[model samples]
Target: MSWMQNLKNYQHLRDPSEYMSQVYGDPLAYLQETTKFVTEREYYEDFGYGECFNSTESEVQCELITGEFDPKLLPYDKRLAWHFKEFCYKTSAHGIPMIGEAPLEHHHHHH
Candidate 1:
């Protein structure tokens, strides 16, 4: 069947060059760089928001400032503060108990 032939051809096809770039490049470094960019942009936007909110005499001025500088507030979603909080929660839930319970099991043997 033609569909079977196409499937077989797809199996033989190699990944694109862009995919190779990602695979060969340092993933951790890329992630760190991306996170750093997001963090800095978020901080700048927050600072701008605070500055504009305080300095502006009217709501219209503040809205204009936000529209010009940060129309969507996209960087806030990628903030490291949120990531760290979520990481701490997950680490506490799964990580703390493993070490805590292991020591308690040995404490019972000493009795």
Candidate 2:
């Protein structure tokens, strides 16, 4: 716990957002970039995690268009993944979709 003990020494200076904004602006883009950055850090602090996604689904459609297991990045029981995915799909079809679910496709794609 040397790191924690050392960190505690700077409790008054614990302004993480200051670094986040200065080094990484644009919340969405920053989230994606940091995920990749942390994967290659030298000191390697992994109290957090990241997931590389290839689908390019808009953030709003992330839960809507795909019946993907939420936070698919987190390790979960594989058997339960299907249930969550199915439920999301079915609920979406039943009208409980997330924001922008029924938009069908991103308007930005046309540009």
Candidate 3:
């Protein structure tokens, strides 16, 4: 609680895009870099998903893409971040599949 409390005392600023770029490194290399890790075990372990992935049939992974984005780094008034990752019930191209039930269709919307 001390650390969380302390974050409120400072007043620093950063570029919004800088948050994600630092979060994932180079944007141009995001596909190559983000696709580099095996995330199923982490998913099963951290989130208690019950399924384990033994294949990299197709997967890109995380604790959540926002897992590494520290809220403490942001101004307390705006200590929020967001993004999305795929839930592959059948096949995963960059990591592993989420096996259990049918994969849901992902609907994308833009503002």
By TM-score, who's the top model here? Answer: 2
Clashing pairs in 3: 57-92, 58-92, 58-93, 59-92, 59-93, 59-94, 59-95
What digit string (tens of lDDT, one per residue) describes model 3 on residues 28-83? 22333234322343332222211122221113233233333344444544212211
Candidate 3: clashing residue pairs, number: 7
Per-residue alpha-carbon lDDT of candidate 1 for residues 30-57, written as tens digits (9 for 90 to 100): 2442334324433222221111212212
Stretches of candidate 2 exceeding 4 Å from the true structure: 1-62, 66-71, 95-111
Report, for every candidate in turn, its global Cα lDDT versus the true structure.
0.25, 0.29, 0.28
Question: What is the TM-score of candidate 1?
Answer: 0.15
Clashing residue pairs in candidate 2, if any?
A: none
Q: Which ten residues in a row have the lowest lDDT in candidate 1?
A: 98-107
What TM-score does prediction 2 earn?
Answer: 0.21
The backbone clash count of each candidate, in order, is 0, 0, 7
Total clashes in model 1, counting residue pairs 3 or more apart in sequence or in different chains: 0
Assess candidate 3 and give its lDDT.
0.28
User: Compared with the true structure, what per-residue lDDT tens digits does model 2 show for residues 5-109?
Assistant: 233234353344422332211234334333443232221221111111211232233333332235335344453344224323234232232221221221233
Reference-based TM-score of each model: 0.15, 0.21, 0.20
